[PDB]
């Protein structure tokens, strides 16, 4: 017994495909399944819907195969044998052998050749010979391939596909298969099972990889995502249900047979105008004998299939019978017009019964005419359904009013049928009876009722699944059923014992798979949603999962969360920042095993609060941060008529009847294209002049070489822009889909951003509110320092340090972008989502929508107009909904880029053209300046900010009393180092002596709380 | 319930949100506006109030000389919030109006399973028990086309309604950065 | 629990793999909304006793 | 062209209402657009389809 080692794939069809990850749903060999092994023995082996036959030998031993269904001297089977130079195929009838064999020449396996049909003599641990057979669809297909092997252990790794060789159009059955060689040579036999695969075609068109969909959960995630590598995260794979155990059927006792014979075998029948009706109730009727009782001339009945009539229960059977004249039968049907249909007997359109008719010439044929049967003639109005008219008085039809007489304008209402034995079948009589459709039930049984397992039921007429537990919802002494909110079927009353149960369907849920990533490892964990996994292990959750899934459905580690229960992960106590979310504050990660824990919000910190304590920084740092925002998306135009008709003159005219649904889509698609140019203009084109940086570079030690354009490259783009362009690359033709080019190129956006940079460097904030006025850069930095509350002499005394920090900060952005390939993620999602929407709109053109074919050429050139409009119209309905869905989703998605484009316009005006005083709008810390950069479909902002450091604690007081007066600071605070008092600014430590010019006086020192004593110079 | 309708739990529970709010309150009480830009620096509360008075153009001797009055006014002002929230139950009308709209859309989806668009019945176990296979496919195809339209209208309105909530969440995050982590000079 | 359904529904294309992707996107979005409002302080602070 | 923005709101809200009324004069794959000729030329059982 040896399992499969990834072997046994073939080419399902003769169609060439390259570089496509196609999916198939054909019979295949399940992966990792054991096969039988044989080696001087060769017994019988059943065929059983497929074979993976393979024999390995270094010498020519295997000769041929013989098949069959019964292996007798009567059965038809093949006699495939191999000659010295040719091959022989013969599927005929011959003589079988109890122990056939085949050592130079042996002839003891056959002695008959009678009734032979097909002959097809044609060309034909060291070597593997693997063959695959199958018999289906009135055909028998043979596939094979061979390859040398250098191994002495077993079948090697990898696989190679199989190709067709021949075909044999035959109709036969086969239930046995035995080989015949020349101690016996080894070989294997495996069977085939329906499955679903996913194969890969290389460039040349050869299958080199395939995966299953029911082996392990990771394979299911691969199938759902349609790829061969899955990244980190949690994915939703499939659903989950329970299967029932058995069925219960319960019918009333009722033991008596319906009076069918007295209705069908009545000697005397009434008239059509005075049809008699008979009521049937509380009986058991078998309709099988009803059809077989006699040969009826017409049984075509509506609403119920006659085969299923034996398994339905009704409330009443209103039978009625009458007699008409020959061809008048055609009026006995709903929606018909005629004398019988109008003035005699009307069938309502909601009729749900059956009609049975037959002739009997040898029952009512008298010579000279049978005048006992009469039928109504000209009347006033139309008879309502199921209404009988019994009046036979003379009716007046004319202007002259007559009273009780006849003659002119007054005639006897009825008329005598001319039933004569020599009359034609058109005027011959006819016998008909109509059945119109709990009391009447058919034959059945009654199995004892179960109480704790969810099973099928057929209580009275309702079919369904669910559990049956006792119900304590008191019923009134006459009710039968019960229904809860939203009209859901519920508690039912048992016909045998007066009892009320409950109905609740078997449990269902959803399955998700957590994967660390195939690049790292392979093991996975599985989560069942909103299910208390007390039923999963064995006896309940076995409907679609192979036994390999059992280890992932039960085991040693099972942990119950609020989102369900997790199988395959262990529970720890300590908590970290979490990576993969699950829900209810539980996350999972990889520790190399899978770890599930609780989230941690952050670290701990207790600020030392006191009545008279303060903290003031003594140093600072300069920081730079990034920010990415999208501005625009790709223009797309789709042609109306080309998509749904495809250059067919027989389709265009059938579309004009629908109206203006076709020209209302192009306008909507043009609106977005118009908007995604104003989006860019609002953001980048807001300076009216082009500025240039001076040739020399003396900016006080600051170095702007990494954001300014370079003259040693044709692109005229900054190195940061080069990296951004190379990181992200800037949906097929045919079928009337086009892409329009943007109005502004990239070499123009580069010019705009260079102009903005030159303006902010050489002028400041002046060029955005009038004419541009020049100013040296360190003076501008002094002005910007004064805007956050720090005096300007701080900058001038620490110029070199600030310049060095600025230069070092800008040199780490390149690394922080080129070392993290997941940084420009916001701009990749807009590109990815647009391609997915356009990829589905082209796959929807290969769908039938309920038609013979999905191509308009085959339908047209296989049929004529009057019955081709029905098939075409069913394709213009489904192909128009696919376009309506696409346009609506794009209108919503474009309202999200407009919101992001409008925000980017605010940032450029308030962060690049000025200094902002709001918080977190323009980065962390205190804002100093900002610089713009260009992206393929967006913008990038680099912010420069101010952050304190190196704090120290002092002692403070709100005021000072001296000579009976209270002294207050002008702009500062009062601090002490333990012996002396000073005055300093709030964002930087720089002590000074308290005097008059930095202090104002108001009031005496007997009101404020916390005043201290000191001296003022 | 049932019929393929599930509700998933949020990632953050209520306790964690309570901890976040408590941390923000502690930071704003014991440290001022400093912790929103760097390391937290302590400062006594009346001095923080004196700082905040300077931002609106009032000199700081006004606060110190009337501390016991501002304290009483602040304490009395908060105590009236409970008496106004407890009464007038229509105060939280912006939060009930979003719970109702979602639940009014799940009812119309389930209630539409009781329609029988141009067919014999509304339940699929009766057209499959009273009819032959070749005929019981025109009736089944009519029910499918109606249930797909009902499930398509539901998704479109959820997309439009979701875009409206994202606008409010983007506004609230601005008020937390600008009116809680610092002082604001914008009007209203 | 009806196979005639699953055999008849396949002919309409992919009109409920598109409906199961919009709702997941909506559900995922109502987690950045809560994170963008409350989670903006790194540490946890405690009021003095 | 000074008051361009406000004029486009009026025009868009009037083009849409015109298209809706004009769509009442299309067959959609039937014999006639008016209901009083469908009934007055066909009998009910197949006039309903
Ligand atoms: C203020 O911080 C700066 C850091 O930005 C300090 O400058 C560094 O000083 C160390 C000496 O201890 C040098 O090794 C570094 O090279 C300096 N940094 C740079 C960028 O040159 C500065 O000394 C600090 N000042 C005080 C008073 O502590
Ligand atoms: C607190 O600061 C005062 C500043 O006035 C320090 O007092 C001076 O300390 C220097 C250092 O020896 C002396 O030369 C001066 O004579 C002191 N007085 C003045 C008026 O400058 C004081 O030492 C500091 N206290 C501590 C603990 O460092
Ligand atoms: C009428 O009589 C015949 C006699 O052979 C019988 O076979 C048939 O079943 C009877 N009809 C009914 C409806 O039972
Ligand atoms: C048959 O009659 C008995 C008598 O009480 C009772 O069980 C019930 O009415 C009938 N059984 C059924 C309907 O299964
Ligand atoms: C400062 O606060 C502390 C804390 O209780 C206490 O000594 C007193 O309330 C205040 N002291 C002075 C001198 O104001
Ligand atoms: C600015 O930095 C770049 C990158 O290190 C360097 O090549 C250039 O020489 C610097 N500028 C000056 C004026 O040295
Ligand atoms: C300041 O000096 C006055 C005058 O003696 C005294 O009354 C007051 O208590 C002193 N204040 C402090 C804080 O020592």
PDB file of C-alpha atoms in Angstrom, chain A residues 128-321:
ATOM      1  CA  UNK A 128       8.234   4.236 -15.470  1.00  0.00           C
ATOM      2  CA  UNK A 129       5.237   3.439 -17.681  1.00  0.00           C
ATOM      3  CA  UNK A 130       2.108   5.194 -16.381  1.00  0.00           C
ATOM      4  CA  UNK A 131      -1.245   4.941 -18.186  1.00  0.00           C
ATOM      5  CA  UNK A 132      -4.679   6.386 -17.414  1.00  0.00           C
ATOM      6  CA  UNK A 133      -7.992   4.988 -18.676  1.00  0.00           C
ATOM      7  CA  UNK A 134     -11.583   6.168 -18.387  1.00  0.00           C
ATOM      8  CA  UNK A 135     -14.980   5.224 -19.821  1.00  0.00           C
ATOM      9  CA  UNK A 136     -17.647   7.941 -19.970  1.00  0.00           C
ATOM     10  CA  UNK A 137     -19.965   9.845 -22.331  1.00  0.00           C
ATOM     11  CA  UNK A 138     -20.157   6.996 -24.832  1.00  0.00           C
ATOM     12  CA  UNK A 139     -16.381   6.964 -25.246  1.00  0.00           C
ATOM     13  CA  UNK A 140     -13.232   5.310 -23.912  1.00  0.00           C
ATOM     14  CA  UNK A 141     -10.135   7.504 -23.700  1.00  0.00           C
ATOM     15  CA  UNK A 142      -6.530   6.384 -23.223  1.00  0.00           C
ATOM     16  CA  UNK A 143      -3.764   8.652 -21.943  1.00  0.00           C
ATOM     17  CA  UNK A 144      -0.100   7.860 -21.452  1.00  0.00           C
ATOM     18  CA  UNK A 145       3.422   9.254 -21.158  1.00  0.00           C
ATOM     19  CA  UNK A 146       6.813   7.765 -20.300  1.00  0.00           C
ATOM     20  CA  UNK A 147      10.063   9.034 -18.771  1.00  0.00           C
ATOM     21  CA  UNK A 148      13.332   7.486 -17.542  1.00  0.00           C
ATOM     22  CA  UNK A 149      13.926   7.254 -13.795  1.00  0.00           C
ATOM     23  CA  UNK A 150      17.207   7.019 -11.866  1.00  0.00           C
ATOM     24  CA  UNK A 151      16.038   5.658  -8.505  1.00  0.00           C
ATOM     25  CA  UNK A 152      15.509   2.302  -6.811  1.00  0.00           C
ATOM     26  CA  UNK A 153      13.247   3.353  -3.925  1.00  0.00           C
ATOM     27  CA  UNK A 154       9.784   4.316  -5.235  1.00  0.00           C
ATOM     28  CA  UNK A 155       8.039   6.738  -7.573  1.00  0.00           C
ATOM     29  CA  UNK A 156       9.978  10.034  -7.617  1.00  0.00           C
ATOM     30  CA  UNK A 157       8.863  13.542  -6.714  1.00  0.00           C
ATOM     31  CA  UNK A 158       7.226  16.030  -9.055  1.00  0.00           C
ATOM     32  CA  UNK A 159       4.850  15.173 -11.864  1.00  0.00           C
ATOM     33  CA  UNK A 160       4.337  15.348 -15.608  1.00  0.00           C
ATOM     34  CA  UNK A 161       1.023  15.679 -17.410  1.00  0.00           C
ATOM     35  CA  UNK A 162      -0.668  13.082 -19.615  1.00  0.00           C
ATOM     36  CA  UNK A 163      -1.931  13.422 -23.178  1.00  0.00           C
ATOM     37  CA  UNK A 164      -4.613  11.643 -25.230  1.00  0.00           C
ATOM     38  CA  UNK A 165      -3.616   8.884 -27.637  1.00  0.00           C
ATOM     39  CA  UNK A 166      -6.733   7.368 -29.243  1.00  0.00           C
ATOM     40  CA  UNK A 167     -10.521   7.294 -29.002  1.00  0.00           C
ATOM     41  CA  UNK A 168     -13.003   4.448 -29.478  1.00  0.00           C
ATOM     42  CA  UNK A 169     -16.692   5.253 -30.055  1.00  0.00           C
ATOM     43  CA  UNK A 170     -18.411   2.307 -28.344  1.00  0.00           C
ATOM     44  CA  UNK A 171     -21.307   1.624 -26.026  1.00  0.00           C
ATOM     45  CA  UNK A 172     -20.521  -0.973 -23.343  1.00  0.00           C
ATOM     46  CA  UNK A 173     -20.226  -1.532 -19.591  1.00  0.00           C
ATOM     47  CA  UNK A 174     -17.097  -2.749 -17.792  1.00  0.00           C
ATOM     48  CA  UNK A 175     -16.786  -4.180 -14.268  1.00  0.00           C
ATOM     49  CA  UNK A 176     -13.441  -6.022 -14.431  1.00  0.00           C
ATOM     50  CA  UNK A 177      -9.877  -5.408 -15.587  1.00  0.00           C
ATOM     51  CA  UNK A 178      -6.904  -7.792 -15.549  1.00  0.00           C
ATOM     52  CA  UNK A 179      -3.487  -7.423 -17.143  1.00  0.00           C
ATOM     53  CA  UNK A 180      -1.272 -10.024 -18.825  1.00  0.00           C
ATOM     54  CA  UNK A 181       2.526 -10.073 -18.904  1.00  0.00           C
ATOM     55  CA  UNK A 182       4.883 -12.172 -21.043  1.00  0.00           C
ATOM     56  CA  UNK A 183       8.039 -13.464  -9.939  1.00  0.00           C
ATOM     57  CA  UNK A 184       5.380 -11.355 -11.627  1.00  0.00           C
ATOM     58  CA  UNK A 185       6.272  -7.795 -12.586  1.00  0.00           C
ATOM     59  CA  UNK A 186       5.190  -5.162 -10.076  1.00  0.00           C
ATOM     60  CA  UNK A 187       2.404  -2.677 -10.776  1.00  0.00           C
ATOM     61  CA  UNK A 188      -0.113  -0.443  -9.011  1.00  0.00           C
ATOM     62  CA  UNK A 189      -3.826   0.290  -9.402  1.00  0.00           C
ATOM     63  CA  UNK A 190      -5.714   3.367  -8.237  1.00  0.00           C
ATOM     64  CA  UNK A 191      -9.221   4.715  -8.699  1.00  0.00           C
ATOM     65  CA  UNK A 192     -10.718   8.065  -9.703  1.00  0.00           C
ATOM     66  CA  UNK A 193     -13.074  10.383  -7.820  1.00  0.00           C
ATOM     67  CA  UNK A 194     -14.853  13.620  -8.788  1.00  0.00           C
ATOM     68  CA  UNK A 195     -12.936  16.623  -7.472  1.00  0.00           C
ATOM     69  CA  UNK A 196     -11.995  20.200  -8.385  1.00  0.00           C
ATOM     70  CA  UNK A 197      -8.427  21.144  -9.301  1.00  0.00           C
ATOM     71  CA  UNK A 198      -6.517  24.306 -10.193  1.00  0.00           C
ATOM     72  CA  UNK A 199      -3.733  23.888 -12.749  1.00  0.00           C
ATOM     73  CA  UNK A 200      -0.982  26.199 -13.982  1.00  0.00           C
ATOM     74  CA  UNK A 201      -0.015  26.535 -17.647  1.00  0.00           C
ATOM     75  CA  UNK A 202       3.517  27.711 -18.402  1.00  0.00           C
ATOM     76  CA  UNK A 203       4.455  29.902 -21.375  1.00  0.00           C
ATOM     77  CA  UNK A 204       4.808  27.007 -23.822  1.00  0.00           C
ATOM     78  CA  UNK A 205       1.470  25.514 -22.770  1.00  0.00           C
ATOM     79  CA  UNK A 206       2.545  22.694 -20.454  1.00  0.00           C
ATOM     80  CA  UNK A 207       0.954  21.927 -17.085  1.00  0.00           C
ATOM     81  CA  UNK A 208       3.605  22.104 -14.360  1.00  0.00           C
ATOM     82  CA  UNK A 209       1.569  22.554 -11.157  1.00  0.00           C
ATOM     83  CA  UNK A 210      -1.824  21.706  -9.691  1.00  0.00           C
ATOM     84  CA  UNK A 211      -3.540  21.917  -6.307  1.00  0.00           C
ATOM     85  CA  UNK A 212      -6.575  20.274  -4.727  1.00  0.00           C
ATOM     86  CA  UNK A 213      -9.518  21.891  -2.958  1.00  0.00           C
ATOM     87  CA  UNK A 214     -10.411  19.270  -0.326  1.00  0.00           C
ATOM     88  CA  UNK A 215      -7.063  18.143   1.110  1.00  0.00           C
ATOM     89  CA  UNK A 216      -6.125  20.758   3.730  1.00  0.00           C
ATOM     90  CA  UNK A 217      -7.481  24.201   4.676  1.00  0.00           C
ATOM     91  CA  UNK A 218      -4.514  26.043   3.142  1.00  0.00           C
ATOM     92  CA  UNK A 219      -5.388  24.500  -0.223  1.00  0.00           C
ATOM     93  CA  UNK A 220      -8.917  25.863   0.171  1.00  0.00           C
ATOM     94  CA  UNK A 221      -7.554  29.349   0.876  1.00  0.00           C
ATOM     95  CA  UNK A 222      -5.350  29.028  -2.211  1.00  0.00           C
ATOM     96  CA  UNK A 223      -8.378  28.040  -4.288  1.00  0.00           C
ATOM     97  CA  UNK A 224     -10.503  30.916  -2.982  1.00  0.00           C
ATOM     98  CA  UNK A 225      -7.763  33.516  -3.504  1.00  0.00           C
ATOM     99  CA  UNK A 226      -6.803  31.950  -6.877  1.00  0.00           C
ATOM    100  CA  UNK A 227      -3.036  32.152  -6.389  1.00  0.00           C
ATOM    101  CA  UNK A 228      -0.041  30.034  -5.427  1.00  0.00           C
ATOM    102  CA  UNK A 229       1.288  32.304  -2.652  1.00  0.00           C
ATOM    103  CA  UNK A 230      -0.880  33.701   0.153  1.00  0.00           C
ATOM    104  CA  UNK A 231       0.253  36.619   2.301  1.00  0.00           C
ATOM    105  CA  UNK A 232      -0.359  37.185   6.005  1.00  0.00           C
ATOM    106  CA  UNK A 233      -3.815  37.792   7.416  1.00  0.00           C
ATOM    107  CA  UNK A 234      -7.148  36.089   8.032  1.00  0.00           C
ATOM    108  CA  UNK A 235      -9.294  34.879   5.133  1.00  0.00           C
ATOM    109  CA  UNK A 236     -12.851  33.576   4.804  1.00  0.00           C
ATOM    110  CA  UNK A 237     -12.940  30.213   3.029  1.00  0.00           C
ATOM    111  CA  UNK A 238     -16.328  28.479   3.085  1.00  0.00           C
ATOM    112  CA  UNK A 239     -19.445  27.649   5.113  1.00  0.00           C
ATOM    113  CA  UNK A 240     -20.374  24.846   7.494  1.00  0.00           C
ATOM    114  CA  UNK A 241     -23.507  22.746   8.014  1.00  0.00           C
ATOM    115  CA  UNK A 242     -24.774  19.479   9.495  1.00  0.00           C
ATOM    116  CA  UNK A 243     -26.307  16.562   7.651  1.00  0.00           C
ATOM    117  CA  UNK A 244     -29.475  14.717   8.740  1.00  0.00           C
ATOM    118  CA  UNK A 245     -29.643  11.069   9.833  1.00  0.00           C
ATOM    119  CA  UNK A 246     -32.916   9.555   8.570  1.00  0.00           C
ATOM    120  CA  UNK A 247     -36.421  10.501   7.437  1.00  0.00           C
ATOM    121  CA  UNK A 248     -39.804  10.202   9.150  1.00  0.00           C
ATOM    122  CA  UNK A 249     -43.181   9.994   7.399  1.00  0.00           C
ATOM    123  CA  UNK A 250     -46.502  10.244   9.246  1.00  0.00           C
ATOM    124  CA  UNK A 251     -49.940   9.893   7.633  1.00  0.00           C
ATOM    125  CA  UNK A 252     -53.428   9.518   9.134  1.00  0.00           C
ATOM    126  CA  UNK A 253     -54.913   6.066   9.657  1.00  0.00           C
ATOM    127  CA  UNK A 254     -57.800   6.335   7.130  1.00  0.00           C
ATOM    128  CA  UNK A 255     -58.718   2.875   5.789  1.00  0.00           C
ATOM    129  CA  UNK A 256     -61.259   2.873   2.939  1.00  0.00           C
ATOM    130  CA  UNK A 257     -61.145   3.151  -0.844  1.00  0.00           C
ATOM    131  CA  UNK A 258     -62.648   5.942  -2.911  1.00  0.00           C
ATOM    132  CA  UNK A 259     -65.848   5.406  -4.949  1.00  0.00           C
ATOM    133  CA  UNK A 260     -63.959   5.766  -8.222  1.00  0.00           C
ATOM    134  CA  UNK A 261     -65.695   2.947 -10.098  1.00  0.00           C
ATOM    135  CA  UNK A 262     -69.239   4.238  -9.612  1.00  0.00           C
ATOM    136  CA  UNK A 263     -68.060   7.516 -11.157  1.00  0.00           C
ATOM    137  CA  UNK A 264     -66.085   6.028 -14.047  1.00  0.00           C
ATOM    138  CA  UNK A 265     -68.269   2.938 -14.627  1.00  0.00           C
ATOM    139  CA  UNK A 266     -71.668   4.669 -14.495  1.00  0.00           C
ATOM    140  CA  UNK A 267     -74.174   3.308 -17.009  1.00  0.00           C
ATOM    141  CA  UNK A 268     -75.991   6.645 -17.411  1.00  0.00           C
ATOM    142  CA  UNK A 269     -74.231   9.987 -17.874  1.00  0.00           C
ATOM    143  CA  UNK A 270     -75.699  13.479 -17.651  1.00  0.00           C
ATOM    144  CA  UNK A 271     -75.578  16.276 -20.231  1.00  0.00           C
ATOM    145  CA  UNK A 272     -72.968  18.978 -20.776  1.00  0.00           C
ATOM    146  CA  UNK A 273     -75.439  21.753 -19.934  1.00  0.00           C
ATOM    147  CA  UNK A 274     -76.543  19.958 -16.735  1.00  0.00           C
ATOM    148  CA  UNK A 275     -73.322  18.329 -15.575  1.00  0.00           C
ATOM    149  CA  UNK A 276     -73.501  16.420 -12.304  1.00  0.00           C
ATOM    150  CA  UNK A 277     -70.912  16.730  -9.551  1.00  0.00           C
ATOM    151  CA  UNK A 278     -69.899  14.279  -6.836  1.00  0.00           C
ATOM    152  CA  UNK A 279     -68.069  14.959  -3.577  1.00  0.00           C
ATOM    153  CA  UNK A 280     -65.235  12.708  -2.385  1.00  0.00           C
ATOM    154  CA  UNK A 281     -63.735  12.986   1.090  1.00  0.00           C
ATOM    155  CA  UNK A 282     -62.108  10.942   3.872  1.00  0.00           C
ATOM    156  CA  UNK A 283     -60.641   8.253   1.653  1.00  0.00           C
ATOM    157  CA  UNK A 284     -57.400   6.734   0.374  1.00  0.00           C
ATOM    158  CA  UNK A 285     -57.062   6.968  -3.407  1.00  0.00           C
ATOM    159  CA  UNK A 286     -54.439   5.189  -5.516  1.00  0.00           C
ATOM    160  CA  UNK A 287     -54.024   7.035  -8.808  1.00  0.00           C
ATOM    161  CA  UNK A 288     -51.640   4.408 -10.214  1.00  0.00           C
ATOM    162  CA  UNK A 289     -54.506   1.992 -10.856  1.00  0.00           C
ATOM    163  CA  UNK A 290     -56.604   4.960 -11.998  1.00  0.00           C
ATOM    164  CA  UNK A 291     -54.447   5.476 -15.089  1.00  0.00           C
ATOM    165  CA  UNK A 292     -54.102   1.732 -15.738  1.00  0.00           C
ATOM    166  CA  UNK A 293     -57.821   0.935 -15.388  1.00  0.00           C
ATOM    167  CA  UNK A 294     -58.526   1.662 -19.068  1.00  0.00           C
ATOM    168  CA  UNK A 295     -56.955   3.140 -22.198  1.00  0.00           C
ATOM    169  CA  UNK A 296     -57.881   6.830 -22.178  1.00  0.00           C
ATOM    170  CA  UNK A 297     -57.536   8.946 -25.309  1.00  0.00           C
ATOM    171  CA  UNK A 298     -56.255  12.089 -23.541  1.00  0.00           C
ATOM    172  CA  UNK A 299     -54.518  12.616 -20.182  1.00  0.00           C
ATOM    173  CA  UNK A 300     -52.927  16.083 -20.137  1.00  0.00           C
ATOM    174  CA  UNK A 301     -53.417  17.808 -16.803  1.00  0.00           C
ATOM    175  CA  UNK A 302     -52.084  20.929 -15.151  1.00  0.00           C
ATOM    176  CA  UNK A 303     -50.554  21.936 -11.832  1.00  0.00           C
ATOM    177  CA  UNK A 304     -49.433  18.535 -10.505  1.00  0.00           C
ATOM    178  CA  UNK A 305     -47.148  15.982 -12.119  1.00  0.00           C
ATOM    179  CA  UNK A 306     -49.019  12.643 -12.311  1.00  0.00           C
ATOM    180  CA  UNK A 307     -45.981  10.740 -11.008  1.00  0.00           C
ATOM    181  CA  UNK A 308     -45.983  12.673  -7.711  1.00  0.00           C
ATOM    182  CA  UNK A 309     -49.767  12.387  -7.277  1.00  0.00           C
ATOM    183  CA  UNK A 310     -49.260   9.353  -5.022  1.00  0.00           C
ATOM    184  CA  UNK A 311     -47.441  11.417  -2.363  1.00  0.00           C
ATOM    185  CA  UNK A 312     -49.729  14.427  -1.839  1.00  0.00           C
ATOM    186  CA  UNK A 313     -52.666  15.117   0.480  1.00  0.00           C
ATOM    187  CA  UNK A 314     -55.522  17.488  -0.376  1.00  0.00           C
ATOM    188  CA  UNK A 315     -58.678  18.664   1.377  1.00  0.00           C
ATOM    189  CA  UNK A 316     -61.379  17.820  -1.183  1.00  0.00           C
ATOM    190  CA  UNK A 317     -61.914  16.307  -4.628  1.00  0.00           C
ATOM    191  CA  UNK A 318     -64.779  17.953  -6.542  1.00  0.00           C
ATOM    192  CA  UNK A 319     -65.362  15.507  -9.386  1.00  0.00           C
ATOM    193  CA  UNK A 320     -67.739  16.266 -12.247  1.00  0.00           C
ATOM    194  CA  UNK A 321     -68.651  14.476 -15.472  1.00  0.00           C
TER     195      UNK A 321
END
